């Protein structure tokens, strides 16, 4: 056996030039795709503003159009998904973890157009859903499609192209190349058993995509919190406690996100229409709040800066928190195409600020700044829910550029994963593949 | 498939006992590394207050600079040759093995040897990093609490060993993220599944990182401040800088190894012809550490100065070559010490250089040598040890210049691609094959 090792060692990191050159072409396409998808979403949300400007006069006629536009966009959304690709629904991340295990199919000839135009509707409508979802899954199929189109054979070529497409898509979605890689190698990849995935082949893809995003999205970031303060050592425990909190709540939020999936299923039973309509209902409901209180609706980024700065009252926080916990489930559990990834980031941020404020006063001698605890908890849900901290801490640190908080960032995020395990929780993204992979047997 | 659904619902459920031990391992590796670090420093210092004592006479001054490092290096190699032939070298490969279960973890020996062994080699001021000694003192520490508490199973044994490692690398470069990423990218069993609890590790890493902070706050290791940004029409320049590090990476590998063989003859295997050739190279370095500190020492002290551009295009090329020398001579001689950090101090230098040449040929880019310095600071860890993801993150974690990230990767990736297409191999892996093969033969 050792005689074998000595063989493999001297043979390590030698990936087929052909696999590398395709990861490079996959990336370039995912990048262009994610850029395009991003552009389209924005154009739509915009066309809706230039529709509320068109009726600024009449208020009720104003609240109506805000609704009917998101309602009419979400419908066209859910439809495309129900009629042409029932997998496009939901995040779309689990459907890839599956495809890497060879348990799920990669119907790209369908999922690409569906998930795409399917998402423009749901995001264009302004619901509470992230972009990664649609892009991580649009990414996979991209890698798949070039795999099949170029005929490339083998486990490496299949698992690799399919895994760069996922990671490249997550990078161009949050403009964070490192988090893209760290995601595959920490979650996305076959969690129990060796796999033929060329990490170096991935980078290439991630970069190619990241660059395509920069070509079109330079001079302005996504989240900008500037440079908050430092965290003295005698301060650390506070982020452990903030971690314990996120820890016990993480599982709960998981119970909700799933149960709601079932409950929201009855409401339509499975009927395409009772579904497409329940969609337009939640779609317009979000296009509404996106006017009468934007902080409860929409993706979630716009408010991260405002919360970290502390420009929200201790009340305005709790309100947004709850209101959002609602708008988020209502949107993810409904089965609309869209990652429940970013909204968790927007959520932790809010629960973070809050913890900060309370801390701020109880300990005046610490000279705290709610902002630090906001950034500490910004990725703490990704820790207790999806249960992947290493990707969380690096995605944050990559968007908030506050490396002097790294320690607290981990101590919070770690305490979250320990309190999610000891209180029963599970990998929200995994639990979903079990739910779907079982419902394939269960129905036999 | 029906098995997967079972495993999924069971994922990330590591034995509380394993976690609580990763926590105690870390705390110890942390305290250890701090202690080690303090020791080295105290020694290097004691040597200054020895050159102050003879500032008058120059030749008598150059002698003492030598005889102290010579006498410290000998006592170093000795302890390694007489009580633990594995403590020699980096010490990183001896753990990659240990995780494969191909090598042994003689902690009852290696801890005291590697430790006082290094204090001798570093305190003398030779060209070796701290990670090696601490990554290996780390693993053993993991082991020790594994045997001492008698935790059984594969998870408990592979996990406490790896955290010991990671946590060891962290407190060495005060960079928790890199610690983790190292294990999961290099250190772990590269071809097969393994029972390692990632979450268990963090805990260790943190515990260590915190121990370091408890005693080493208020100042960093490398401080280059905040350099400029890098326009898109500038990227290709880092790819080229990457292609360079890429073809030279393998060559530096051939040298680091061949020199190992050639330096072997000079003593044959004889404990003394070795312990002496050690005091020779040890005193040689304690000398240059006076007549030209840039050629000797760990290598950190000069990274700031080079990135700032406070070195002539000549003074660079000199330091580079002088160092490529002082580095092999020290690592291939088999002394206890990582050839990790010194590659960092090397990339930085070759980086600055590329910078300067670029700066002038393209005045319309408005470049700053410093950005290419930091783009290449981790470019050797990319072409030699062939682990980029850990490199890019190690740098980024010490230089804090996230706005360079794109170039950093494009350089580093270009290095790994030019190292593969030009024959090279994982310098840290190739060393395990060398030793694992010399074992069954």
């Amino acid at each position: 056996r050792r005689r074998q090792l000595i063989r493999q060692l001297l043979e390590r990191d030698k990936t087929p030039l052909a696999i590398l050159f395709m990861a490079a072409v996959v990336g370039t396409l995912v990048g262009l795709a994610a850029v395009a998808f991003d552009k389209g979403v924005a154009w739509l949300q915009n066309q809706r503003m230039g529709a509320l400007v068109h009726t600024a006069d009449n208020y009720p006629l104003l609240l109506t159009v805000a609704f009917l536009c998101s309602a009419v966009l979400a419908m066209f959304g859910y439809f495309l998904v129900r009629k042409y690709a029932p997998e496009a629904g939901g995040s779309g991340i689990p459907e890839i973890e599956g495809a890497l295990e060879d348990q799920r199919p990669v119907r790209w000839w369908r999922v690409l157009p569906v998930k795409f135009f399917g998402g423009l509707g749901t995001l264009g409508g302004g619901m509470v859903l992230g972009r990664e979802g649609p892009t991580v899954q649009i990414g996979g199929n991209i890698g798949r499609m070039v795999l099949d189109i170029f005929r490339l054979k083998g486990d490496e070529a299949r698992h690799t192209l399919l895994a760069t497409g996922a990671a490249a898509g997550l990078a161009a979605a949050f403009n964070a190349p490192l988090a893209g890689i760290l995601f595959i190698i920490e979650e996305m990849r076959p969690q129990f058993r060796y796999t033929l995935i060329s990490i170096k082949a991935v980078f290439i893809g991630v970069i190619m995509s990241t660059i395509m995003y920069r070509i079109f999205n330079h001079e302005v970031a996504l989240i900008d919190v500037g440079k908050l303060s430092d965290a003295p050592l005698n301060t650390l425990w506070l982020y452990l406690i903030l971690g314990i909190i996120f820890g016990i709540f993480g599982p709960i939020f998981n119970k909700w996100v799933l149960g709601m999936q079932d409950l929201l299923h009855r409401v339509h039973g499975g009927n395409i229409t009772k579904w497409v309509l329940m969609g337009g209902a939640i779609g317009g409901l979000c296009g509404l709040l996106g006017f009468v209180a934007p902080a409860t609706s929409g993706g979630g980024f716009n408010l991260i800066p405002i919360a970290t700065a502390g420009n929200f009252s201790m009340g305005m926080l709790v309100f947004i928190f709850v209101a959002r916990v609602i708008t988020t489930l209502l949107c993810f559990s409904s089965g609309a195409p869209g990652g429940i990834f970013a909204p968790m980031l927007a959520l932790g941020t809010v629960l973070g600020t809050a913890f900060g404020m309370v801390a701020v006063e109880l300990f005046p001698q610490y000279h705290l700044e709610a902002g630090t605890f906001a950034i500490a908890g910004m990725g703490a849900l990704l820790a207790a829910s999806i249960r992947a901290p290493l990707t969380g801490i690096i995605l944050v640190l990559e968007m908030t550029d506050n490396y002097q908080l790294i320690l607290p960032m981990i101590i919070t995020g770690l305490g979250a994963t320990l309190l999610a395990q000891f209180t029963g929780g599970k990998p929200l993204y995994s639990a979903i593949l079990a739910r779907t992979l079982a419902k394939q047997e269960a129905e036999q | 498939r029906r098995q997967l659904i079972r495993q999924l619902l069971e994922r990330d459920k590591t034995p509380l006992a394993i976690l609580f031990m990763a926590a105690v391992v870390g705390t110890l590796v942390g305290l250890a590394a701090v202690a080690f670090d303090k020791g080295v420093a105290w020694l290097q210092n004691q040597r200054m207050g020895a050159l102050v004592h003879t500032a008058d006479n120059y030749p008598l001054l150059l002698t003492v600079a030598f005889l102290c490092s010579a006498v410290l290096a000998m006592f170093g190699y000795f302890l390694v040759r007489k009580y633990a032939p594995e403590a020699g070298g980096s010490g990183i490969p001896e753990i990659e093995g240990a995780l494969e279960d191909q090598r042994p973890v003689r902690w009852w020996r290696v801890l005291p040897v590697k430790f006082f062994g290094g204090l001798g080699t570093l305190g003398g001021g030779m060209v070796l990093g701290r990670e090696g000694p601490t990554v290996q003192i780390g693993g053993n520490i993991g082991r020790m609490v594994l045997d001492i508490f008698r935790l059984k199973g594969d998870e408990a044994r592979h996990t406490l060993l790896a955290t010991g490692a990671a946590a060891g690398l962290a407190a060495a470069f005060n960079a928790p993220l890199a610690g983790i990423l190292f294990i999961i990218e290099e250190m772990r069993p590269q071809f097969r599944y393994t029972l390692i609890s990632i979450k268990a590790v963090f805990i260790g890493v943190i515990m260590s990182t915190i121990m370091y902070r408890i005693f080493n706050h208020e100042v960093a290791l490398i401080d280059v401040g905040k350099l400029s940004d890098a326009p898109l029409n500038t990227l290709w320049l880092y790819l080229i800088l990457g292609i360079i590090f890429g073809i030279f990476g393998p060559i530096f590998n051939k040298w680091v190894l061949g020199m190992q063989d050639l330096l072997h003859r000079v003593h044959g295997g004889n404990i003394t012809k070795w312990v002496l050739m050690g005091g020779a190279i040890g005193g040689l370095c304690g000398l240059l550490g006076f007549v030209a500190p840039a050629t000797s020492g760990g290598g950190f002290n000069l990274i700031p100065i080079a990135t700032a551009g406070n070195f002539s295009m000549g003074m660079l090329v000199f330091i580079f070559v002088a160092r490529v020398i002082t580095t092999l001579l020290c690592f291939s001689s088999g002394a206890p010490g990582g050839i990790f950090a010194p590659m960092l101090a090397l990339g930085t230098v070759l980086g600055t250089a590329f910078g300067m040449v670029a700066v002038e040929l393209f005045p319309q880019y408005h470049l700053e040598a410093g950005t290419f310095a930091i783009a290449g600071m981790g470019a050797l860890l990319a072409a030699s040890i062939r682990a980029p993801l850990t490199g890019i993150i190690l740098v980024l974690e010490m230089t804090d210049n996230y706005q360079l990230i794109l170039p950093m990767i494009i350089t580093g990736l270009g290095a790994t691609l030019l190292a593969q297409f030009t024959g090279g191999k994982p310098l840290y892996s190739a060393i395990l094959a060398r030793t694992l093969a010399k074992q069954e033969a």
């Epitope: 303060s229 003295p232 050592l233 005698n234 301060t235 502390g310 300990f363 005046p364 001698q365 610490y366 000279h367 700044e369 | 706050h217 208020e218």
Partner: antibody, heavy 120, light 107 residues
Framework: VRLLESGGGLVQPGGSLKLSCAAS????????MSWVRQAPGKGLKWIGE????????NYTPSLKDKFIISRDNAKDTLYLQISKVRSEDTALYYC??????????????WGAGTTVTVSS | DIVLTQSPAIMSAAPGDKVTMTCSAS?????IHWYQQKSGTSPKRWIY???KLTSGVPVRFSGSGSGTSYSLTINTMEAEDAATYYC?????????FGGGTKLEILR
Amino acid sequence: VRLLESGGGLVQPGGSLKLSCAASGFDYSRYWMSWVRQAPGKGLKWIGEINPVSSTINYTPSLKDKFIISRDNAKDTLYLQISKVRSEDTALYYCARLYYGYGYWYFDVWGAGTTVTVSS
Amino acid sequence: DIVLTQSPAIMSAAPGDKVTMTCSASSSVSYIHWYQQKSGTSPKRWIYDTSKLTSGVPVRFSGSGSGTSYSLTINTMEAEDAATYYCQQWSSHPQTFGGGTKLEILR
């Protein structure tokens, strides 16, 4: 790094006076700054403190606006306004810069401090 | 508002001697800080975090103490240690200072 505070003087009971501390040689932001006063023969008594973005300002236990503390991060200066002054205000006023080791803040760098006199 | 109370009010000691001055909090304090003040000069930050010497203090000084009682010592004081020391805590908002111990060279 210099902490030069001016503005002290002779005011009469019931008066006012803006003390001023100007800083040089180190980034004014990122820092917390606070005033401490010493009455002759007597000891040091912390007056108040203020952070970078002056989003927080705390005083020792005093009446409503006995003390108004502000800083202007553009002129790298810290002020301190006292009002309705009694002789208990007759003192030497120091400005500091705030930092920490483990995290239990101390008064890092002092200044020479101007003198207030409260008389008729 | 812990009440720090320095011990000897005023005290003399001949050079090379060994001196200790106290600082008893009224409640619980942690990492007392010390300041030196030579007639005419604004306080200087001597010892901090109960035992650390601020970059520059002669190692003649040694900070110490715990929970309710702390102290400072000069292992062989010189004459350039003629000053007045102020203990200070800020483990419990708001910061408080000691009564001050006056150190005077005996001759």
